[PDB]
Amino acid sequence: ASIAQARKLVEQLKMEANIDRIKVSKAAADLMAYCEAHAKEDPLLTPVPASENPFREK
Amino acid sequence: KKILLPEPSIRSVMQKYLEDRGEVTFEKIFSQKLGYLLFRDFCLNHLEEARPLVEFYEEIKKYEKLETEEERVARSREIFDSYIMKELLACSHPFSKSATEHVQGHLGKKQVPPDLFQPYIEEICQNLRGDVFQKFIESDKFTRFCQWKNVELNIHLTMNDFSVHRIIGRGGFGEVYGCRKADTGKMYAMKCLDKKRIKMKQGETLALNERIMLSLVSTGDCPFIVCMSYAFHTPDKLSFILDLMNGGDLHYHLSQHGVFSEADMRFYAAEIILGLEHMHNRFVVYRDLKPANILLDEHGHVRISDLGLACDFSKKKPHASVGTHGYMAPEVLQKGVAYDSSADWFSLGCMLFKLLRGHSPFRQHKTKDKHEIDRMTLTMAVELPDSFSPELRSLLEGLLQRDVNRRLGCLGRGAQEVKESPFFRSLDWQMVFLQKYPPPLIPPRGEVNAADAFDIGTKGIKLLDSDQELYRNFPLTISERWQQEVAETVFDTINAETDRLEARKKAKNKQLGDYALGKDCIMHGYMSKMGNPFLTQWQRRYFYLFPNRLEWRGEGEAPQSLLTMEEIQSVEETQIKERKCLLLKIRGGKQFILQCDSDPELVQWKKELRDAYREAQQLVQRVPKMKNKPR
Amino acid sequence: SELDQLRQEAEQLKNQIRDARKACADATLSQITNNIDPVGRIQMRTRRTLRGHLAKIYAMHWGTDSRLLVSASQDGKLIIWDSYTTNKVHAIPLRSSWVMTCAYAPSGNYVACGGLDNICSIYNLKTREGNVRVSRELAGHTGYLSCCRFLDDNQIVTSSGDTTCALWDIETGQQTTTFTGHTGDVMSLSLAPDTRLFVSGACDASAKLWDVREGMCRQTFTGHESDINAICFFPNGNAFATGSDDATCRLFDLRADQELMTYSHDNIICGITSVSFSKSGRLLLAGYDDFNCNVWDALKADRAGVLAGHDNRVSCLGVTDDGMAVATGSWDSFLKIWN
Numbered sequence A: 001a002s003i004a005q006a007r008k009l010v011e012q013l014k015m016e017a018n019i020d021r022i023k024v025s026k027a028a029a030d031l032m033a034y035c036e037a038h039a040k041e042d043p044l045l046t047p048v049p050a051s052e053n054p055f056r057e058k
Numbered sequence B: 001k002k003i004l005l006p007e008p009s010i011r012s013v014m015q016k017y018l019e020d021r022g023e024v025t026f027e028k029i030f031s032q033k034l035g036y037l038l039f040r041d042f043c044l045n046h047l048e049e050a051r052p053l054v055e056f057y058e059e060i061k062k063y064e065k066l067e068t069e070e071e072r073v074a075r076s077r078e079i080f081d082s083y084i085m086k087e088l089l090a091c092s093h094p095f096s097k098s099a100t101e102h103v104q105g106h107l108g109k110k111q112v113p114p115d116l117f118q119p120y121i122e123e124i125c126q127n128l129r130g131d132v133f134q135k136f137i138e139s140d141k142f143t144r145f146c147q148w149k150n151v152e153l154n155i156h157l158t159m160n161d162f163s164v165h166r167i168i169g170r171g172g173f174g175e176v177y178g179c180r181k182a183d184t185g186k187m188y189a190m191k192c193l194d195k196k197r198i199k200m201k202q203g204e205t206l207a208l209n210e211r212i213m214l215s216l217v218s219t220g221d222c223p224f225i226v227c228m229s230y231a232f233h234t235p236d237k238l239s240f241i242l243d244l245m246n247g248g249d250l251h252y253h254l255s256q257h258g259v260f261s262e263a264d265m266r267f268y269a270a271e272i273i274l275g276l277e278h279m280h281n282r283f284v285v286y287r288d289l290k291p292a293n294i295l296l297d298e299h300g301h302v303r304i305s306d307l308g309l310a311c312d313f314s315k316k317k318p319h320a321s322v323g324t325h326g327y328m329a330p331e332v333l334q335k336g337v338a339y340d341s342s343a344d345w346f347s348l349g350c351m352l353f354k355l356l357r358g359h360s361p362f363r364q365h366k367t368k369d370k371h372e373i374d375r376m377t378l379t380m381a382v383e384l385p386d387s388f389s390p391e392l393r394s395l396l397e398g399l400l401q402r403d404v405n406r407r408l409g410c411l412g413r414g415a416q417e418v419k420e421s422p423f424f425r426s427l428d429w430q431m432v433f434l435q436k437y438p439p440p441l442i443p444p445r446g447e448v449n450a451a452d453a454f455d456i457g458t459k460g461i462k463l464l465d466s467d468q469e470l471y472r473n474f475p476l477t478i479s480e481r482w483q484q485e486v487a488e489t490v491f492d493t494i495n496a497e498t499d500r501l502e503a504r505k506k507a508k509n510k511q512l513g514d515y516a517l518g519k520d521c522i523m524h525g526y527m528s529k530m531g532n533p534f535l536t537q538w539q540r541r542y543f544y545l546f547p548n549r550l551e552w553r554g555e556g557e558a559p560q561s562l563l564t565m566e567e568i569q570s571v572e573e574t575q576i577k578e579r580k581c582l583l584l585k586i587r588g589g590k591q592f593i594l595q596c597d598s599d600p601e602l603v604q605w606k607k608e609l610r611d612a613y614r615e616a617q618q619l620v621q622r623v624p625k626m627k628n629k630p631r
Numbered sequence C: 001s002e003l004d005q006l007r008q009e010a011e012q013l014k015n016q017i018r019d020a021r022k023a024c025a026d027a028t029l030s031q032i033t034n035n036i037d038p039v040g041r042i043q044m045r046t047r048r049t050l051r052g053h054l055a056k057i058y059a060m061h062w063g064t065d066s067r068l069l070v071s072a073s074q075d076g077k078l079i080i081w082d083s084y085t086t087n088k089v090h091a092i093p094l095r096s097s098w099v100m101t102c103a104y105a106p107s108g109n110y111v112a113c114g115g116l117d118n119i120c121s122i123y124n125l126k127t128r129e130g131n132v133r134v135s136r137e138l139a140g141h142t143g144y145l146s147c148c149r150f151l152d153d154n155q156i157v158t159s160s161g162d163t164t165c166a167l168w169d170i171e172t173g174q175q176t177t178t179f180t181g182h183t184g185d186v187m188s189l190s191l192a193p194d195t196r197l198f199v200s201g202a203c204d205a206s207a208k209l210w211d212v213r214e215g216m217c218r219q220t221f222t223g224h225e226s227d228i229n230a231i232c233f234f235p236n237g238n239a240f241a242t243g244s245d246d247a248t249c250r251l252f253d254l255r256a257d258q259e260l261m262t263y264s265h266d267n268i269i270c271g272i273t274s275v276s277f278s279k280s281g282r283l284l285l286a287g288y289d290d291f292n293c294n295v296w297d298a299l300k301a302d303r304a305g306v307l308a309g310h311d312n313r314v315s316c317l318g319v320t321d322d323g324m325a326v327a328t329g330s331w332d333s334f335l336k337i338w339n
């Protein structure tokens, strides 16, 4: 209904359109690389000894 | 046995209860006896800005009750120099120019009527309502008011609430007993009507109308009408709690003493006239005025009793022939002819003639032919004997005028006309109202059979279930009557006891270490919940109702249990062992039963739980994170 | 003619955005990760059960110390628990019974909450005598407060049912910034690790990436078919996950500006109420309305495990900063620590 509102919407869509995007393959590779790089520091993936676990008889 | 006040926490419920009825205003509280007492106690003891205003009000109220003009001459000057003049000197006089001008002009002109300070009454009232009244509402005096009001609104009288003593009256439908109300010690009469007799003679409407008329008249504290303080009923009886009149009626005293002289009948006439004035000011016609319905107290003063045949004419005038043959007005006997108060003036003439002569003026040779008395009343004027004085002759002439156009008291000024009769030249009617004239007949202490009906010449029927419905709204308590009873008996001592108990509990609470403050709590107070129904498990817990939940705690623990408004499906009132209780239906088939200590608590808890659960459910529906989603 | 032209230009711009995104979609995350070994079955047990709340728990939030946590309940209370001992560090009675969210400041000095009162209340934990008192009441939203997250002790970000988010200066109590763009109630927000961006999910079935300092919406993601109830950043800040009433979780990548993965199963029809990543980001934990928590392989989209220890809706969850445990709060009034 509002002309100014529609102008604002068009400018926002311009902002969203004029960005630099990367290929999905590169983004997936980067995510997989982060997961692999930090797998060792994840106590839910690599179970820690119970002595180093605060929630197991400590 | 005695009155026990609820704990001050009752305020939380009561204040809202009264607020739902527009009863926490200045008019509603100040005009009540206990309300005025507590408000005045607050202003005098616990406030400084309002103390002189209340003292002024009280000085004016005591000035109004001064009898002679010289007492008022002295007291008006004292009031002016103490409450008006000095406040004007200190510029702290909060009153209009007109009021000071009126009072000073009457004083300089040496005119001192009893209503001299009425503008000051109005302006003191306007100065007390508001910030002072709000600060009173904030104080613990208003909490004590809530306690007393809960006690008042939880009255449920039974026979066991009265110690019943000797019979002071026998009728064809019941008896009147002298009794004492146990909680206050106030002496009363108890009129018990038998429902089986009522059924046999089809007089249910008469009893209901008697209760309604008693309710209409029992305010204002009329000294000359047998007024009602309470009405209740048992499966077999209807009971009115009335002014104690154990001196017998005037029919018996007429048969005993004989005819009364003019001077003796003048006393009874004046008191009955004041009673009739009180009734007519409230649009009531007694219609049954006769010596049998005029009762005497222990001192000889008289009252009108048995309002069964009275009716309200503020809207509709009657035409039916109701009364006792010999006292009914010509326009009364004529069925299909409207009339109002005029019947009572003619009946007054008849009864005064009977007191002077021993018989109704229209029953002349002991003829029991009712039609003969009718015939004499409707056609032939009464022959007033040579023994009568001319003043009394004019009084009876004017009262016994067969036409209403000429009848004394019906000519546009009412009882006032009868007061101005030359028969009452000597009477100061203020002294009549104050019961200052010596009664001509003082009943003997403790004597017997002073008030039986002339007819004492019995069967019984079963009582149907519908008949008990016919008496559903019979219970009634006159608030002004109960507050006056309490004020003159146990108000101060119970207040002192309760003060002291709450002080001791404050000591204990500040040695052991409030949950409702600082939050959005809607209401809080004591209620009993039911555990195992077979163990009679009732647990008294303090409940807090919040917009989304109802928590409860015991004495010594924080609330460890609650019930959410979301899971409440329905709130309903239900009878459990002859007691009104609350039943909550919970999501999941469960039930949650609550029990209150008083009727106002029950009604308010029901209202608030219903409002809270409905509003909270409607609100939760609109919140995506909180609402129930399909599964 | 101008409003019509603006509408047609907005349509053309949406088409251009979609075509750019499709020009970027050369492969899928499922193809990229097809070669890595599966995680197997993730089996976790309850080490602690936090008992105390008298009604539904709506939200919880771990402290940065990975030990203390705060929770908001239908009983009108916040509780700050020591998860190691199950002892209640603090029990805060709120001024409004309609609490919906809570947050633990990174310093551990403040907590925050709010709800249908349309106010974000900031509670100081260390006062003069050591009591808990309301230090601030941020008022400005015209709708219920759905989520809030501290940037530091002096700035906080809130989301509201008035379709807006906001950045507040706690000291002055002012709305320094308003993030407007959603067309439905904002349900959840998540801060990026560097706290210069944040994402918000809303009932308009869209998520939005905003620049905190600039106060603008940088990106808008669609794809969900119903309300987005929860949102969580991937630990490196380049991706995020959303849980929705459509019974699916979704992984979106920022630099590719589109959706990377859907986490769903034909036997799961109820909605998701909370989402969180494990420390490395390999596991995606999601709370469901069927009383369970599902642990997904974030890289391969397979369901790795289930935490089934609640008798009612799992309304919130959260992994510690050290990744040692995951807390779950439910409509059954209990919190449970899992690993």
Ligand SMILES: O=C(NCc1[nH]nc2ccccc12)c1cc([C@@H]2CCNC[C@H]2COc2ccc3c(c2)OCO3)ccc1F
Pocket (backbone or CB within 6 Å): B168, B169, B170, B171, B172, B173, B174, B175, B176, B189, B191, B192, B193, B198, B203, B204, B206, B207, B210, B226, B242, B243, B244, B245, B246, B249, B292, B293, B294, B295, B305, B306, B308, B451, B452, B453
């Ligand atoms: O049956 C009685 N009256 C008829 C009726 N009353 N209400 C009725 C409702 C439906 C149908 C009939 C009804 C009926 C009369 C009386 C006496 C009889 C003699 N004359 C005065 C009457 C008043 O005695 C009172 C004595 C001391 C009192 C008092 C009253 O009050 C204050 O201390 C006594 C008990 C009755 F039971």
Ligand SMILES: [Mg+2]
Pocket (backbone or CB within 6 Å): B318, B319, B320, B321, B331, B332, B333, B334, B335, B336, B337, B338, B339
């Ligand atoms: Mg008539």
